Amino acid sequence: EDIIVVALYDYYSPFSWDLSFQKGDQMVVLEESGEWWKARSLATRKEGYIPSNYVARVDS
Amino acid sequence: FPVRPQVPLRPMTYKAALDISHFLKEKGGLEGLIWSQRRQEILDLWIYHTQGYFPDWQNYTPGPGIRYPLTFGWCFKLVPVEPEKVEEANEGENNSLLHPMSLHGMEDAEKEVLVWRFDSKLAFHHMARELHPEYYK
Incomplete structure (x- = not known):
């Protein structure tokens, strides 16, 4: 989908509603309500919430 | 906590409070723990740092x-450890x-x-507000 981000730091979360990820991971953004975004991992298709300051939007 | 940028700030909600207390109940570590400041x-800072x-x-x-x-x-609510007192029934001179x-x-x-102590009823009955409506207006 239109909005793709790359992780800048590891994000570990003990909570099932969060998407945990590794630095350098690519994700699709699904929702930008405030600063906690909903995302899907490009690699696993796993979905959840992410802290938007852990991530950078890229062109294409 | 290991050094990482602080995750974005947001106000506590009914739903976050519900989900996190359910998590704590299912993972263990808090149910039956003695309260201290x-x-x-530690609990507050962990919720702040993670969420x-x-x-x-x-x-x-x-x-x-x-x-x-x-x-x-x-x-979660905080429950006194000492068993609740049975006020009855005082005797005479030999009561001691x-x-x-x-x-x-x-x-x-x-x-x-x-x-x-975990209490599932806190999800539907706002006990603090029943006891203390003056805290809410």
Whole structure:
């Protein structure tokens, strides 16, 4: 989908509603309500919430 | 916590308070733990560090007795450890012999000792607001 981000730091979360990820991971953004975004991992298709300051939007 | 950028700030909600207290209940570590200011600080800071909720939400109603959370959705309350007293039924001159608990020295600590207890009813019954509507307007 239109909005793709790359992780800048590891994000570990003990909570099932969060998407945990590794630095350098690519994700699709699904929702930008405030600063906690909903995302899907490009690699696993796993979905959840992410802290938007852990991530950078890229062109294409 | 290991060094990482602080996750974004947001105010506590009924739903976050519900989900996190359910998590704590299912993972263990909090149910049956003795309350202290320091243990609460740890809990508050952990929720802040992992999820971004500013730690100014976890207030409980004043004692004595059970302390109920002001945040509707948070399913832990603080329960006194000492068993609840059976006020009846005082005797005569020999009451100290029949009831050792009434001997001078056996008195409860001036500060009530408390333990965290999960209570599923806190999800639907806002006890703090029933006891203290003045906290909410």
